[PDB]
Amino acid sequence: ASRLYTLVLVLQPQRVLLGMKKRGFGAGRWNGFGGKVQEGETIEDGARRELQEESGLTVDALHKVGQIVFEFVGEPELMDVHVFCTDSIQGTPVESDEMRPCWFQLDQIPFKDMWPDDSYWFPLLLQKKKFHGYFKFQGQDTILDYTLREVDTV
Numbered sequence: 001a002s003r004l005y006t007l008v009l010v011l012q013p014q015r016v017l018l019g020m021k022k023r024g025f026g027a028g029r030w031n032g033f034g035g036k037v038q039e040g041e042t043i044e045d046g047a048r049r050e051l052q053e054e055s056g057l058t059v060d061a062l063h064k065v066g067q068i069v070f071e072f073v074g075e076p077e078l079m080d081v082h083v084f085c086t087d088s089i090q091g092t093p094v095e096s097d098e099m100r101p102c103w104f105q106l107d108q109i110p111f112k113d114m115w116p117d118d119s120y121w122f123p124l125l126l127q128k129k130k131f132h133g134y135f136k137f138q139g140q141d142t143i144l145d146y147t148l149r150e151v152d153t154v
């Protein structure tokens with residue numbers, strides 16, 4: 001009962017790019033860039049497309065860094081989120097009516113205004129670790145339970 005999604009973090013040695021979504025799912029939080037994977041598209045090509053569509057950047061190499069399954073209690077469909085990072089981009093982030101991108105220094109990551117799971121796995125991403133996670137939410141603000149482990153391959 002799972003649907004594929006991508007999430008891409010643009011992570012340079014001293015800063016990370018995040019976007020504030022204006023509407024829809026996740027509005028009002030900072031997050032990486034991503035969305036649903038399409039019919040006939042690989043997960044990685046989906047990740048590249050969503051980065052490009054939502055941020056305006058052009059990405060060359062993407063690196064798999066994690067997989068997180070999200071459950072919302074009562075909702076049948078699980079979100080199977082494939083997480084990628086890149087430090088090899090072209091262009092400048094573009095603010096649109098849907099998305100406002102902003103660079104953050106690594107010691108000023110805005111965890112209080114991000115999805116609450118990010119506090120758990122972002123520190124792993126920043127230390128170049130790979131991970132498998134599962135988070136069970138009740139509504140959008142409450143983590144009921146979770147698992148998170150480091151892995152050598154995603």
Ligand SMILES: Cc1cc(-c2ccco2)c2oc(N)nc2c1
Nearest residue numbers: 005006007034070081115117118
């Ligand atoms: C429930 C949930 C979903 C997503 C998501 C959907 C599509 C891409 O990511 C999240 O992203 C983060 N950082 N927490 C998240 C929680």
